[PDB]
Design an enzyme around this catalytic site. Structure first.
Site, PDB file in Angstrom:
ATOM      1  N   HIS A   1       8.859   1.279  10.543  1.00  0.00           N
ATOM      2  CA  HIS A   1       7.870   1.034  10.306  1.00  0.00           C
ATOM      3  C   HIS A   1       6.497   0.661  10.946  1.00  0.00           C
ATOM      4  O   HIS A   1       6.551   0.670  12.342  1.00  0.00           O
ATOM      5  CB  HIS A   1       8.093  -0.470   9.611  1.00  0.00           C
ATOM      6  CG  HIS A   1       7.291  -1.599   9.259  1.00  0.00           C
ATOM      7  ND1 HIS A   1       6.257  -2.480   9.631  1.00  0.00           N
ATOM      8  CD2 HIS A   1       6.405  -2.000   7.846  1.00  0.00           C
ATOM      9  CE1 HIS A   1       5.312  -2.946   9.678  1.00  0.00           C
ATOM     10  NE2 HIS A   1       5.086  -3.030   8.335  1.00  0.00           N
TER      11      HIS A   1
ATOM     12  N   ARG B   1       0.117  -5.489  -6.013  1.00  0.00           N
ATOM     13  CA  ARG B   1       0.706  -4.304  -6.272  1.00  0.00           C
ATOM     14  C   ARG B   1       2.701  -4.351  -6.556  1.00  0.00           C
ATOM     15  O   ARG B   1       2.851  -3.737  -5.102  1.00  0.00           O
ATOM     16  CB  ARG B   1      -0.327  -3.372  -6.036  1.00  0.00           C
ATOM     17  CG  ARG B   1       0.087  -2.077  -7.788  1.00  0.00           C
ATOM     18  CD  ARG B   1      -0.523  -1.132  -7.122  1.00  0.00           C
ATOM     19  NE  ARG B   1      -0.618  -0.119  -8.071  1.00  0.00           N
ATOM     20  CZ  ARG B   1       0.586   1.013  -7.923  1.00  0.00           C
ATOM     21  NH1 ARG B   1       0.630   1.140  -6.982  1.00  0.00           N
ATOM     22  NH2 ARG B   1       0.265   1.909  -8.811  1.00  0.00           N
TER      23      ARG B   1
END
Lengths: 285, 286
Positions: free
Chosen positions: A91, A245
């Site tokens: 990540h 989103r």
């Protein structure tokens, strides 16, 4: 205040990261998804799935703006979940926040970092990952690596499992203690760093043989990852609660997770080694 | 303590035995394994989990009775359960019944609970049946009980970030003290007994339905939604994790396997798509 230079860098970073990953997989490519917000910017979501090497991956860019005087936020965010359990999940994030106003001094700060989440860790790779991190921090100050590596250990921890999420890396927020040009250079070093730190690990481990039992372990471990992201991760929490989103926000979730009551690997095996030794060691420089 | 809390405890321990026995009788292969615990101040519980059965892949039916502080001197007892079948054609289900008693002033108390159905391959008649049982058990308590608590269920078990209901509904209530204690307790027993009458006949009727690996795949993607609800939204899971409760007992509710995919969605017009197209939005079942 060169916000446009930052945006240009972030778009180029997304491209470079995407090309580097594609070159490692040699089969699947990133499919792009542009989106916008009514009078509030937008972004480019880029996702990869079912490759030779990457099972599920996302590298998202966004530039949004609004008010609460009139703010704008731009960043790149990514989570990579390889197919081979011997390649770690990873990540990264680098972002800028700027809020301006007539008759006022601008307020701004950077945030970001990167971290490694192995399933079958290798000491060599952990040292290498943190070495890249230490070296990129070095010119910014004698204590920058230790400050932000410690912050990464503290943030990516799962209290209800009493486990670190991974072997660490760098994490920072509210970064504006240096001049803008120095913070931006830092953003660039962290983004560059992720490619230098992660891609050679992928390259090295992607052809390591594995078995169905190792995927099963990988899938139980991915339950921990989903737990951190859905229970603890601040960015994920806010996105889901503030009408962000959803598919972009939950891009980070693993492709497959398993949970079992009292599930645990057998002590003394390679499966248990991650939690017995690698996650607790914390000293990688 | 003039309130009959011991009688409530006895009922709850027996309800756990009865739910466990009925689920076992349907599976015929796997049995529940028991994890007993105690904690400071006379609290404790019995966690019971079933796994890898012919019918139930993962399941939990937990009893808890804890004494605490904050409010002040309180007591909580309840049974909680989540059942995840192996066959996609048998729905997941959840239930809970509980009592809270807060103690030089007369004690304050309220009941909470309900039950609900989370299908993957829903059937019209099964959804009707589930709600009918809920409606029948409510009728002796008041003319508006079913409608209020079925609506509360719809409101609570909703995933805003997916714009989806978790399942086809059921009953949900909390802070229930609008009747005398004995009537509220009778309602708790009705809801507990109701879960068995609502769910077990569906499991019995749908367990031998032929299924395929692609229907299992669909099941696992849907179970991503279930994990999202429990980890992001569910209050009982949140408080249980954040205050340092018993992790394995609280996360009992999670599916054995979940899947996530970027923009994952069933093909419009297929049996998979009809769950979200029609079943989760219908709402009116009686």
């Amino acid at each position: 205040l060169p916000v446009e230079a930052v945006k240009e860098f972030l778009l180029k970073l997304q491209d470079d990261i995407c090309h580097a990953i594609e070159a490692e997989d040699e089969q699947a490519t990133f499919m792009e998804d542009k989106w916008t917000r009514e009078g509030g910017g937008g972004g480019r979501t880029r996702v990869i799935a079912n490759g030779a090497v990457i099972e599920k991956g996302g590298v998202n860019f966004s530039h949004v703006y609004g008010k609460g005087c009139n703010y704008q936020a731009m960043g790149v965010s990514l989570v990579i979940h390889p197919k081979n359990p011997h390649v770690p999940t990873s990540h990264a994030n680098v972002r800028l926040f700027v809020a301006e106003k007539e008759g006022k001094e601008p307020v701004w700060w950077f945030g970001g970092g990167f971290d490694l989440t192995p399933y079958y860790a290798v000491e060599e790779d952990c040292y290498y990952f943190h070495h890249v991190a230490q070296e990129l921090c070095r010119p910014f100050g004698a204590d920058v690596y230790e400050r932000f590596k410690a912050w990464c250990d503290e943030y990516f921890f799962i209290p209800h499992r009493n486990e670190a999420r991974g072997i660490g890396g760098l994490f920072f927020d509210d970064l504006n203690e240096w001049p803008f040009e120095k913070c931006f250079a830092f953003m660039q070093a962290v983004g560059k760093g992720f490619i230098d730190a992660y891609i050679p690990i992928v390259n090295r481990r992607k052809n390591t043989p594995y078995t169905e039992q190792q995927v099963e372990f990988q899938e139980f471990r991915r339950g921990r990852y989903a737990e951190f992201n859905l229970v603890i991760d601040r960015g994920t929490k806010f996105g889901l609660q503030s009408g962000g989103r959803t598919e972009s926000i939950l891009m980070s979730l693993p492709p497959r997770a398993r949970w079992g009551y009292n599930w645990h690997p057998e002590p003394g095996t390679p499966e248990a080694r991650l939690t017995e030794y690698f996650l607790t060691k914390k000293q990688w420089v």
